[PDB]
């Protein structure tokens, strides 16, 4: 069965709600497991209290740097980096979950949520899931985003984990 995980999001001084994500363990089991484990914090580290450090309205939101908090760091449950598992899933529309990287085979913890179809990213980033509920919460983040991506108020994963 496909993992169901969540982020509770706080934007500035307000709780924004819950994002629920389905992970495609059927296609990218290793990549899905990394993300799932970082949501639950079962290895002793993960996305809890991590921020979204870039928000570009109508393009995407990026987060998952729980090491440095600024988009320069991160680590996976497999070590500092792990290989691109496959490129079978596409950045086909709103809510697609994909791994940020610094070139081939440099996956860590950073990820982005697409808020539009971005086919041009296919074959560059490993897609591993999709937002299934709380699309409004992803869209809410735009209130503190900008065209450059600079974030105006803290966007924090106040709580995260796995759902039944």
Curated annotation (Swiss-Prot):
EC number: 5.2.1.8
Catalytic activity entry: [protein]-peptidylproline (omega=180) = [protein]-peptidylproline (omega=0)
Residues of the PPIase cyclophilin-type domain: 6-162
Isomerase among keywords: yes
Keyword annotations of the record: Cytoplasm, Isomerase, RNA-binding, Rotamase
The protein's name: Peptidyl-prolyl cis-trans isomerase E
Regulation: Binds cyclosporin A (CsA). CsA mediates some of its effects via an inhibitory action on PPIase.
Gene Ontology molecular-function annotations: cyclosporin A binding; peptidyl-prolyl cis-trans isomerase activity; RNA binding
Family statement: Belongs to the cyclophilin-type PPIase family. PPIase E subfamily.
Keyword DNA damage: no
Compartment annotation: Cytoplasm
The protein's role, per its UniProt record: PPIases accelerate the folding of proteins. It catalyzes the cis-trans isomerization of proline imidic peptide bonds in oligopeptides.
Domain of life, source organism: Eukaryota
Gene Ontology cellular component annotations, sorted alphabetically: mitochondrion
Protein's GO biological process: protein folding
